[PDB]
From TrEMBL, chain C:
Signal peptide location: none
Family affiliation: Belongs to the SMC family. MukB subfamily.
Domain notes for this protein: The hinge domain, which separates the large intramolecular coiled coil regions, allows the homodimerization, forming a V-shaped homodimer.
First-to-last residue of the parent protein present: 199 to 247 of 1482
Record's subunit section: Homodimerization via its hinge domain. Binds to DNA via its C-terminal region. Interacts, and probably forms a ternary complex, with MukE and MukF via its C-terminal region. The complex formation is stimulated by calcium or magnesium. Interacts with tubulin-related protein FtsZ.
Functional summary from the UniProt entry: Plays a central role in chromosome condensation, segregation and cell cycle progression. Functions as a homodimer, which is essential for chromosome partition. Involved in negative DNA supercoiling in vivo, and by this means organize and compact chromosomes. May achieve or facilitate chromosome segregation by condensation DNA from both sides of a centrally located replisome during cell division.
Localization (cell): Cytoplasm, Nucleoid
Species, as recorded: Photorhabdus thracensis
Name listed for the protein in its UniProt record: Chromosome partition protein MukB
Length: 50, 49, 49
């Protein structure tokens, strides 16, 4: 019930954010014309954060 | 008698299935709360992958 | 979609639309606990109908 569900959801979210952050680093400093880097921006929706 | 015996098998099957369910199938009745009441993590969950 | 988008080149429209569907794996742990806990009610409701 309650808190434990929130904790498993939070840990899953945290793990996904971290893995994305690791993938994200391999793409730093890639030169394509005037583009110099690429990222996958991950964010949490407010209506679900509250 | 046949009806009741098959019922016993079905009950055993559901209980067996249920043990493997969640969250990382274990003795979930108390273990999840026991996992958070200390600053720890369930070992079976560490070996999920 | 992946292969042909690579073949022709460019920022694929379809990949861009469904980005979460491509980049995130689906996790069962959060769900199956509640499907099993929910089971008794589901069967009862269906029986009543």
């Amino acid at each position: 019930s309650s808190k434990s569900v929130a904790n498993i959801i939070r840990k899953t979210i945290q793990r996904e954010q971290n893995r994305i952050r690791m993938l994200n680093q391999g793409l730093q400093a890639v030169s394509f014309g005037q583009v110099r880097g690429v990222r996958l921006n991950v964010n949490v929706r407010e209506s679900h954060a509250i | 008698v046949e009806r009741d015996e098959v019922a016993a098998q079905k009950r055993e099957l559901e209980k067996q299935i249920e043990r493997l369910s969640q969250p990382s199938g274990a003795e979930d009745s108390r273990m999840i709360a026991l996992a958070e009441r200390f600053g720890g993590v369930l070992l079976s969950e560490i070996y999920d992958d | 979609r992946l292969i042909e988008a690579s073949l022709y080149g460019g920022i694929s429209s379809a990949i861009t639309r469904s980005l979460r569907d491509y980049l995130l794996p689906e996790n069962s742990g959060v769900r199956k606990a509640f499907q099993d806990m929910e089971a008794a009610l589901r069967e009862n409701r269906i029986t009543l109908e």
